[PDB]
């Protein structure tokens, strides 16, 4: 999965 | 063609889900050379984030398709997929460079010495868009945009630790994106986890003193932080 | 040629329907007949493009009616910009249809002819949606013509459960209801098509039952909304 | 709520 950002 | 109607047109474009026009209106407002209020700042941020996010989603889809068409070995198919990915990538890079020019020439420059909040906001934007440029760059230009994003993030984080509250959503989002840069861009899980946990703990230390709206705004980004932390294991 | 089609499929996967429409437009400009897959790709691409334009236009018109001379002038100018974009998309589709798609239909290719005439009626209806005053008249009449012809052909050479005929009846009833404000004729057409498809509902077998039942439920929904 | 088309 991709890291959650703003 | 004055500022009020330009901000109104940005809001219109947002309601009409036409984020290119919204970004154009806010670019004009910024090109008026006057500092942006919090509302205008958030409008510009939302516009350009939606634009770059649409381009990023398209690029992700096409690159994921390309990674399998490459393993299959079809020449014409991989050629067309690579060409389309490069088209979307050039669009993304153009949007990012437009944002970076607006930041360096207008936004960061017109910040007063005591305007630490706007400094942190604009430096976080610079780091974010240089990281977006890094997501698609290969070779020495990748290292260059990585260094640019690193410098922007570090300057923003220093100003934020000195003059901003740990529970402020700008500081929390800056720390979140900085940790994501450490993990996904630098492949440095140690410092990524360290920074994310430090931000989460500094926010926990003062979560009790927040208003309802502040509590919600901060706890959303803290949820994001701890989700990224659990993911990095 | 297949590179253009796979580029259109890539654009659809990337939710970039402008590029998909451009690729299918080039494929059409190759002056060769379109397969069922390519026909559906072209339809979907231009439908998504014009639908984004229609959604933006409806939002802007609702805001214009819901609301200072400068702000109102700015709203009207933005609505005019979106109107011009939508009319350009519709004119592009209509030129593609009149120059290549309908023109390359043989005298017996009733399915593709009904498909393209329904597309023509749809995009003339999309023109009439934003048209006001005198200029509206013509773009209504064209939409009535392309539908009407497409009706007769589909009435003569296609089964009532055919999804093309059912979708044509759906859009034709929608035209009669919203463009011409003739709810009696619209309800009559929709109910006739629905009951004709119901009478021969047993003819669908696991291969075309969904594509027909979805349009039949849309017909029923429009009928229950109108009455 | 407007009419449904295909």
Q: Which other chains touch chain B, taking contact as 3+ CB pairs less than 8 Å apart?
A: A, C
Q: Is the dihedral of CA B3, B9, B12, B16 positive or negative?
A: negative
Q: Which of residues 1-6 of D touch C (CB under 8 A)?
A: 1-6
C6·B80 Cβ contact <8 A: yes
- DSSP conformation letters of C163-195: HHHHHHHHHHHHIIIIIS--HHHHHHHHHHHHH
Taking CA–CA distances from D5, the nearest residue in chain C reads C171
Please state the φ and ψ torsions of residue C117, each to the nearest 5 degrees. -70, -35
Hey, which residues 50-89 in chain B have their CB within 8 Å of chain C?
Answer: 54, 57-58, 61-62, 65, 76-77, 80-81, 84, 88
CA separation, residue B45 to residues B10, B42, B129, B150, B178 (Å):
11, 5, 11, 20, 18
Indicate the CATH number of C1-226 among 2.60.40.10, 3.30.56.10, 3.40.630.30, 1.20.190.20: 1.20.190.20
**Sequence-ordered list of residues with C-beta below 8 angstroms from that of C170, at least 6 positions apart, any chain:** C190, C193, C215, C218, C219, C222, D4, D5, D6
B24 part of contact set with chain C, CB < 8 Å: no
Question: Any CB–CB contact under 8 A between C6 and chain B?
Answer: yes
Q: How many CB atoms lie within 10 A of CB B209?
A: 10
Please state whether at least 3 CB pairs lie below 8 Å between chains C and D. Answer: yes
Chains A and D touch (3+ CB pairs under 8 A): no
CA atoms within 13 A on the CB side of C182: 12
Q: What radius of gyration do chain A's Cα atoms show?
A: 5
Q: Where are the alpha helices (DSSP H) in B38-188?
A: 38-72, 75-102, 116-136, 140-163, 169-180
The encoded tokens of residue C127 equal 């023109």
Cβ distance of C170 and D2 shorter than 8 Å: no
Q: How many other CB atoms are found less than 10 A from the CB of residue C24?
A: 27
Number of neighbours of residue B127 by Cβ within 10 angstroms: 24
Greatest C-alpha distance within chain C: 61
**Pairwise CB contact (< 8 Å): C78 & B4:** no
CB-based contacts of C186-191 (< 8 A; 24+ apart in sequence): C186/C226, C187/C223, C187/C226, C187/C227, C190/C219, C190/C222, C190/C223, C190/C226, C191/C223
Q: Using CA atoms, how far apart are residues B111 and B109, in angstroms rounded to an integer? A: 6
Q: Which residues of C touch B8 (CB under 8 A)?
A: 71, 74-75
Kind and range of the H or E element at C128? helix C110-130
For C171, the token pair is: 């859009």
Angstroms from A4 CA to nearest CA on chain B: 6
Judging contacts by C-beta atoms under 8 Å, the chain B residues touching residue A5 are: 128, 176-177, 180, 224
Q: How crowded is residue B199: how many other Cβ atoms within 10 Å of its Cβ?
A: 25
Contact in structure between C104 and C38 (CB atoms under 8 Å): no
Give chain B positions within 8 Å (CB) of A1: 231
Contact B117, B81 (CB under 8 A): no
Q: Which of A1, A2, A3, A4 to mutate to test the interface with B (most CBs of B within 10 A)?
A: A3
| CATH architecture of the domain formed by B3-232 | Up-down Bundle (1.20)
CA C117 to CA C114: how far, in whole Å?
5
Please note each residue after which chain D is broken, C-to-N distance over 2.5 A, or write none: none
Answer for the pair C30, C16: CB distance below 8 angstroms, yes or no: no
Q: What letter would DSSP give residue C127?
A: H
Among residues C29, C17, C89, the alpha carbon closest in space to that of C53 is found at C89
3-state class of C12 per DSSP? helix
């Amino acid at each position: 999965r991709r890291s959650s950002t703003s | 063609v004055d500022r009020e109607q330009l901000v109104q047109k940005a809001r219109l474009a947002e309601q009409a889900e036409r984020y290119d026009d919204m970004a154009a209106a806010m670019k004009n407002v910024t090109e008026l050379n006057e500092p942006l209020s919090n509302e205008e700042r958030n409008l510009l941020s939302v516009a350009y984030k939606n634009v770059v996010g649409a381009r990023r989603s398209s690029w992700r889809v096409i690159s994921s398709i390309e990674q399998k068409t490459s393993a299959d070995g079809n020449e014409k198919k991989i050629e067309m997929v690579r060409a389309y990915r490069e088209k979307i990538e050039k669009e993304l890079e153009a949007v990012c460079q437009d944002v970076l020019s607006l930041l360096d020439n207008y936004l960061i420059k017109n910040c007063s010495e005591t305007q630490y909040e706007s400094k942190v906001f604009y430096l976080k934007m610079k780091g974010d868009y240089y990281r977006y440029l890094a997501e698609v760059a290969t070779g020495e230009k990748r290292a260059t945009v990585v260094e640019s994003s690193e410098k922007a993030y570090s300057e923003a984080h220093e100003i934020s630790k000195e003059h901003m509250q740990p529970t402020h959503p700008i500081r929390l989002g800056l720390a979140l994106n900085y940790s994501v840069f450490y993990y996904e861009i630098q492949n440095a899980p140690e410092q990524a986890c360290h920074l994310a946990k430090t931000a989460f703990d500094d926010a926990i230390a003062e979560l009790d003193t927040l208003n309802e709206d502040s509590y919600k705004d901060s706890t959303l980004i803290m949820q994001l932080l701890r989700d990224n932390l659990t993911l990095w294991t």
